[PDB]
Every structure is written in structure tokens, then in C-alpha cells.
Amino acid sequence: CQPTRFISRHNIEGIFTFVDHRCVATVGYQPQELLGKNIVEFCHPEDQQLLRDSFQQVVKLKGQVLSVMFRFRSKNQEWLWMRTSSFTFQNPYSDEIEYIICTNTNVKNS
Amino acid sequence: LDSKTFLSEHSMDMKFTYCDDRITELIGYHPEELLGRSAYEFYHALDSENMTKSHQNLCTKGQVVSGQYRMLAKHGGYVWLETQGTVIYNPPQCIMCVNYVLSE
Numbered sequence: 001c002q003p004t005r006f007i008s009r010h011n012i013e014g015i016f017t018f019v020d021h022r023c024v025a026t027v028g029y030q031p032q033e034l035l036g037k038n039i040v041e042f043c044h045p046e047d048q049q050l051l052r053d054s055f056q057q058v059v060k061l062k063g064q065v066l067s068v069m070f071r072f073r074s075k076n077q078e079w080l081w082m083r084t085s086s087f088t089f090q091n092p093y094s095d096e097i098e099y100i101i102c103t104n105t106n107v108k109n110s
Numbered sequence: 111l112d113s114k115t116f117l118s119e120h121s122m123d124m125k126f127t128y129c130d131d132r133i134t135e136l137i138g139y140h141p142e143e144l145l146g147r148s149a150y151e152f153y154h155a156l157d158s159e160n161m162t163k164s165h166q167n168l169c170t171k172g173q174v175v176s177g178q179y180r181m182l183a184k185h186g187g188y189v190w191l192e193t194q195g196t197v198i199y200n201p202p203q204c205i206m207c208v209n210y211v212l213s214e
């Protein structure tokens with residue numbers, strides 16, 4: 001059985017700048033209910049600071065993978081355990097600000 | 111009443127841009143730690159869609175009363191509040207929030 005999962009892109013602050021439509025079946029929101037909002041707003045209070053320090057760190061990790069587990073508030077208002085694997089991308093033909101590519105999977109905490 | 115009432119100001123994205131210091135005696139936060147953060151970060155999960163709805167009324171009407179919601183306190187637990195919000199448009203420029211704490 002496939003794990004349920006969607007790709008997103010964020011700015012270094014955590015704001016969703018791109019959301020793959022596989023999100024509907026993963027967390028139940030439409031892409032546009034996510035776009036423009038910070039991923040930390042959907043995060044469990046006890047996990048918000050981890051997630052913010054995760055975003056801060058992924059940019060110092062030289063484009064390598066950072067992974068984080070946290071509880072994400074589904075459109076049912078249930079807390080779903082998420083594993084987000086993220087890494088930065090920066091086109092080396094440019095000196096534009098790097099951004100953050102995430103893959104987001106509903107996992108078991110156990 | 112009065113000592114349970116404080117103002118905050120928000121950008122159109124709901125981020126804090128200003129808060130009365132009185133929030134410190136009531137909820138524990140320092141106004142400076144609030145700035146740049148969405149109101150969203152702070153609601154109880156069970157209130158969140160409701161606030162999104164009050165928000166939409168605020169944007170379409172220009173003023174609204176939130177009705178009752180919970181804010182996660184600085185040192186754990188949740189405080190109940192009721193807020194009146196008012197959009198300041200110029201020639202939307204910001205949101206003024208009058209926030210009344212219902213509970214300890």
C-alpha cells in the first residue's frame with residue numbers, strides 16, 4: 001500500500017509557495033487553503049518550535065535532506081502525524097534566494 | 111474588565127505588528143515575541159475554522175466580533191477571549207483588535 005504524501009515548496013520563513021494536489025487526500029485541504037499560509041499554523045503547539053528550527057536548519061545543511069516529524073491539523077481538525085523531508089534548491093546559474101522543497105507523508109508514530 | 115482588555119494590531123495576513131504590554135499580565139507573552147507571527151499559530155485547534163470564518167466576515171464587512179475562542183498561553187493551557195476586530199483601510203492597511211479575556 002502506497003503511503004499518502006504530497007510535495008510542497010516554501011520560502012525560508014515556512015510560508016507555502018507551492019502545494020501538490022495530492023494534499024487533499026493526505027490532509028484534506030485544497031491546495032489554495034494551504035498557499036500563502038505558514039506551515040507552522042497547521043502545526044501542533046508542542047511541535048511548532050521544532051518545525052521552525054527545522055526550517056532554519058535545512059538552509060544551513062548545504063542542500064542535504066532534513067527530516068522532521070510533527071502533528072498536522074487535518075481539515076477534520078484531527079492531529080495527523082507527518083514526516084516532512086526537506087532540502088533546499090538553488091539554481092547555480094543564479095544567485096536567487098534558495099527555497100525549500102518538502103515531501104510530506106502521514107506516518108505512524110509507533 | 112479594563113485590566114482584562116488589551117489591544118493588538120495585525121497585518122492583513124493576521125500577523126501581529128503591535129501588542130499592548132498588558133498581554134504580559136494576562137497570557138504571559140511579551141509583545142516583542144509576538145511580532146511577525148500569525149494569530150493562527152495561537153488558536154486552539156477546535157477554534158481555528160471558526161476564526162477563519164470570523165476573519166472572512168471581517169474582510170467582507172470591515173468590523174466583526176469574534177465570539178469565543180481559546181489562545182494557547184505562554185506557559186501551557188488556554189485562555190478564552192472575545193475580540194472585536196476593525197479593518198483600517200486608507201485613501202486595507204491593518205486590523206485593530208480589541209481583545210477581552212474571558213478566563214484565567
Ligand SMILES: N#Cc1cc(F)cc(Oc2ccc(S(=O)(=O)C(F)F)c3c2CC(F)(F)[C@H]3O)c1
Pocket residue numbers: 118120121122123124125149152153161162164165168174175176180181182193194195196205206207209
Ligand atoms: N489566539 C489569539 C489571538 C490573540 C489576540 F490578542 C489577537 C488575535 O488575532 C485576532 C483575533 C480576532 C480577530 S477577529 O475578531 O477579527 C476574527 F478573526 F475573529 C482577528 C485576529 C487577527 C486578525 F487578523 F486581525 C483578525 O482575524 C488572536
